Design a binder for this molecule. Sequence first.
Ligand SMILES: O=C(O)c1cccc(O)n1
Length: 115
Amino acid sequence: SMSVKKPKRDDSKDLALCSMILTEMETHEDAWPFLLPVNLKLVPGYKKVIKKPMDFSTIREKLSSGQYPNLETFALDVRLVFDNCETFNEDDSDIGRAGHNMRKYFEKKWTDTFK
Ligand SMILES: O=C(O)c1cccc(O)n1
């Protein structure tokens, strides 16, 4: 609170560390469903069902242009990709399995890098 500050975690390297984690997800072989925005004019249901679409290229653009205030807002957009994937796909499908795999892959890198 006012004039009572908790000790400050060092955040100076967060931009480059997030950028690196994103690079690794972009090159994972199961990233293909998540590389580009879903086409809302061509894909049934998506625009109406998925209220906040997110994809790796949109995250890369936001990261490169100063649109993430901090670590946590970046992790929220990455998790959003995989939450959208669960909402729109059966677990028992190739895309549904790709989402589960990419999420596991992300959270491990997250813990290792920061926790
Ligand atoms: O064909 C599908 O099941 C599909 C298409 C677009 C996005 C998405 O999540 N799934």
